[PDB]
């Protein structure tokens, strides 16, 4: 998803 | 549980502006975090990404190279250094925290702080 | 991915059922979110994942939808309800852009 992957711990 | 912008005002064309966002009542070294912007006329802007470790970060077209995010995960602030301010940046700013999510995607946006009003006038 | 909300503006009274569309220019998927904004507050996430309602959002509350048609239903309006509503798409590789609102109000 690039910049619209999971962006969490 | 509340996210709190501050650094707004009033700020002079071509000039800069840091907004700071303290984060509070959560594990915020855990999550992603936005800005999003609002101005009256046009409804909501996303406007930057930054990972739960500072190791990615993405922005919007209209601030690309202009607009830099990071955080601070020891005193749980977000920041927004904008330089190069134009009358188009006018707007409330939000802080903004991801929904948090397990697996591959990303989530909406669950926690909203009041929002910073900046003003580029001269 | 631009995304569309018509109409734009919407009377209704306490009671009624409201049903709120938005249009993705592309394809999304599910990657749909739902929130309410009255004049001078942060918005409200209603529901994520064009579906799945939020913690503590009432059950009135419902949307539904996949690819480039999701609706938001509010079932019985409620006197709180009056306010300023965004679909947003948050879809692989699209970055994270939001429909320009439907703003239900109070008739006459």
């Known amino acids: 998803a690039n910049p619209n992957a999971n962006p969490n711990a | 549980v509340q996210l709190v912008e501050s650094g707004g005002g009033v700020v002079q064309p071509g000039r800069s502006l840091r907004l700071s966002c303290a984060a509070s009542?959560?594990?915020?070294?855990?999550?992603?975090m936005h800005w999003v912007r609002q101005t009256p006329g046009k409804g909501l802007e996303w406007v930057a990404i930054?990972?739960?470790?500072?190791?990615?970060?993405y922005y919007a077209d209209s601030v690309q190279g202009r607009f830099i995010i990071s955080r601070d995960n020891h005193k749980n602030t977000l920041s927004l250094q904008m330089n190069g301010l134009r009358a188009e940046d006018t707007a409330v700013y939000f802080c903004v925290r991801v929904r948090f999510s397990v697996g591959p995607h990303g989530s909406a946006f669950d926690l909203w702080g009041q929002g910073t009003m900046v003003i580029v006038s001269s | 991915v631009q995304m569309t909300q018509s109409p734009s503006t919407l009377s209704a009274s306490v009671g009624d059922r409201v049903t709120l569309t938005c249009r993705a220019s592309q394809s999304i998927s599910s990657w749909l979110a739902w929130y309410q904004q009255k004049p001078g507050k942060a918005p409200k996430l209603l529901i994520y994942?064009?579906?799945s309602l939020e913690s503590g959002v009432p059950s009135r509350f419902s949307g539904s939808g996949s690819g480039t048609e999701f609706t938001l239903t509010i079932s019985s309006l409620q006197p709180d309800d009056f306010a300023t509503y965004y679909c947003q798409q948050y879809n692989s590789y699209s970055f994270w852009t939001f429909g320009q609102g439907t703003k239900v109000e109070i008739k006459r």
């Open positions: 009542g959560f594990a915020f070294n855990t999550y992603g």
């Open positions: 994942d064009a579906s």
């Open positions: 930054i990972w739960y470790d500072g190791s990615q970060k």
